[PDB]
Curated annotation (Swiss-Prot):
This is Phosphatidylinositol 4,5-bisphosphate 3-kinase catalytic subunit delta isoform. Pathway: Phospholipid metabolism; phosphatidylinositol phosphate biosynthesis. Residues 712-728 are annotated as: Activation loop. Residues 693-701 are annotated as: Catalytic loop. It catalyses: a 1,2-diacyl-sn-glycero-3-phospho-(1D-myo-inositol-4,5-bisphosphate) + ATP = a 1,2-diacyl-sn-glycero-3-phospho-(1D-myo-inositol-3,4,5-trisphosphate) + ADP + H(+); a 1,2-diacyl-sn-glycero-3-phospho-(1D-myo-inositol) + ATP = a 1,2-diacyl-sn-glycero-3-phospho-(1D-myo-inositol-3-phosphate) + ADP + H(+); 1-octadecanoyl-2-(5Z,8Z,11Z,14Z)-eicosatetraenoyl-sn-glycero-3-phospho-1D-myo-inositol 4,5-bisphosphate + ATP = 1-octadecanoyl-2-(5Z,8Z,11Z,14Z-eicosatetraenoyl)-sn-glycero-3-phospho-(1D-myo-inositol 3,4,5-triphosphate) + ADP + H(+). Heterodimer of a catalytic subunit PIK3CD and a p85 regulatory subunit (PIK3R1, PIK3R2 or PIK3R3). Interacts with ERAS and HRAS. It is found in: Cytoplasm. One of its GO terms (cellular component) is cytosol. Transmembrane segments: none annotated. The keyword Heme does not apply. Residues 66-152 form the PI3K-RBD domain. The gene is Pik3cd.
Amino acid sequence: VKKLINSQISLLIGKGLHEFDSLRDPEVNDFRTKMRQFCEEAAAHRQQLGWVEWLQYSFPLQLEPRALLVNVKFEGSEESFTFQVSTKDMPLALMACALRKKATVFRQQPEEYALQVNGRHEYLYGNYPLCHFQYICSCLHSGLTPHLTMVHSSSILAMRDEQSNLWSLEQPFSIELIEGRKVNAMKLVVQAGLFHGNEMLCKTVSSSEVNVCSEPVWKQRLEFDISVCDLPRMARLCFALYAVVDCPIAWANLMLFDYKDQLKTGERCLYMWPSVLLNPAGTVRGNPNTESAAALVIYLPEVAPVYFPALEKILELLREILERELYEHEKDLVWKMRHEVQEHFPEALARLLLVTKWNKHEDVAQMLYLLCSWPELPVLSALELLDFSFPDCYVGSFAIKSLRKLTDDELFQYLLQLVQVLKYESYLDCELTKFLLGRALANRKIGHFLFWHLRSEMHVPSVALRFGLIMEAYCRGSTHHMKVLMKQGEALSKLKALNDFVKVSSQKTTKPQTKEMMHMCMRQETYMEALSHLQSPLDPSTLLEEVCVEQCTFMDSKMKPLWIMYSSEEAGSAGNVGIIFKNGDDLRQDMLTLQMIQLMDVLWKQEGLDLRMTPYGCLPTGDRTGLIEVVLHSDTIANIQLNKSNMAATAAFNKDALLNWLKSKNPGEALDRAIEEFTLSCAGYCVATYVLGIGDRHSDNIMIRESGQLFHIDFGHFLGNRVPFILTYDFVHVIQQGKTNNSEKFERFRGYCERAYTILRRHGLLFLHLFALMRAAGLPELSCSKDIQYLKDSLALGKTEEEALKHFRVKFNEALRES
Ligand SMILES: Cc1c(F)cncc1-n1c([C@H](C)Nc2nc(N)nc(N)c2C#N)nc2cccc(Cl)c2c1=O
């Protein structure tokens, strides 16, 4: 039976476990073994969780950063009770009324129950007011009634049990460039370099020119200007093979120490990766395609059986003005006064690490000595220390320790970045991986998105091995969740097949007939079973039950993305949800953008500013494949501004097209609120697109909800890849209630944008650190530091608050006149 588990893991993660064994790699063998035990311990520790502690695992509380209707029922019968509680009351008080009424009806304690949202994997519990749970707030703003279900602890325990599995070497370092066998048309050079992060340990050495028609020989010694004893634990030997008369050919990196801290000897064949000159941030593992990849055979001198010194023998061995790059005389000053840093400037650790002589072991030993006695840093400081610019393992481990105090909501917000950092790791076994795995096994919602973040990039060879092992390890921690995720993969597998059929059919057949054929294909037994009854990959708390084939369709645009609607006779209206399956686009940029907008939303509302944003879900699931959450009861600006006849939004002037639409959806007194929702949401996405630099904003990639809420879609383009600010007049026409003159509901809108802009400025370092880590993703519009510089200037983080606010209004003033 252990085999089927092994078999469905292989099917799930998208690569056979036999391939792991086929490598015969001791490092791989150690990773799988060591973490299988760790995840199985967490599995046995998880199930020791009491029934309440189990709720916190499987269904973590969804909290947002006067009376109301609430109906509640029990699991046994479908007979219901509608109570009238306040938004102040605890779920306990509500459960008390539910039991008391049940008593009265049937014959005649609340702590033994939990409130489940109808038809969703979301629960209401704890000592929180009802208006703290986001489901209740979602009902308050929608005007719907919260339908809850009294779930006893005995059935919750049933849910639990059902998921059941030397400094002596002072001679110069050097190598032996032997052979390899390439491809080009001239002469050829091999430039090698030693790196500790993004900067060199010493001066790079180049090979001697050797003819192209080769498969060559060099057998040339490359002596580096650095002692062997001074090689840091995380030193990288980076090669660069290129032709010259400059045409780059290939690159390859290598650690000088294995995962067992042993100095490497001797000969090694380096299967290089194609290029675009040195690439120090690249992977340290060779090209898996050993058939086509050019190799580079080197040899490492036997300098003795030496290992990198244990930490125990390492421990043996004008500033405030320049606190906001640095000059050499300033670096000297920071390093000289390094003890005062630890004592009085604890969070200035990053700066102190950047002035540390990493090419000299004595300076590193002293630095590591201070780090071992260094006070815990805030989350924001630790996020910076995760970057590749701090490649030392003990530093990366220290940053992890400062991130152990991450709340699950914080971790969820930063998870995308933390996963991309795994690409900076030099070894499979690292503190970051175990932290991610540990938190994923403690929180099913974290584990859900951790999986899909790894599974989405299994098509990428340089991370296929690492991500595949981590997912396998997680599966050991929960065989049940593995089955749940596998149900999601089978649905996505059918959607892929369905979309291929739609793509082909729509090119040789009209849309209505294609949509008709789409329906017939979906009505197949294998499609009905695969696409139904599953946890939405976009949101595991959202259940996708019965698929409404009649409500399913596709768009006439390039990739013909699918529109799949769902319904549930258990969730009521909260079950009528939809997903958008798109195949062909790199949805990674949309996910990042929407996550950052979501972050802005959190930062705004925990300051008391609810700009009524619509951060819909967007999750890449495979190679240029992913899902997008359907925003119900909405429409694009362009479709509304079509001024379609025979309707209610038909206007005498195109200016009134959008305003007439709102009044048709919000009759009478309901209008005034829709105007506000529009005004708030407009100011939000406005500031959001300016900061993130989202250009190409037109009426086709901008939508509006019937409640009035304005929201943007299809973010392929951020960080100006320089974008001015984007204020069209028809939106202003709505904000000013239609009248051409309306200063106070416009200046108030102006105040909305400015406050929303200043709030993001104070959290500017958060956006800087997160984007810096996201450079590891390999996103085309986020690779160089000039993309980062854009965010610096959009937030004006080098300037004072009113200096930036003054400048912020300048472009605001420019946007209103070209309007
Ligand atoms: C084009 C369009 C429209 F004019 C009005 N409403 C919806 C559409 N529309 C859209 C729009 C443009 N995109 C979105 N629409 C909603 N409601 N929520 C979103 N999160 C997004 C997004 N991103 N995408 C599709 C993707 C596939 C198949 C179809 Cl069949 C449609 C489709 O119809």
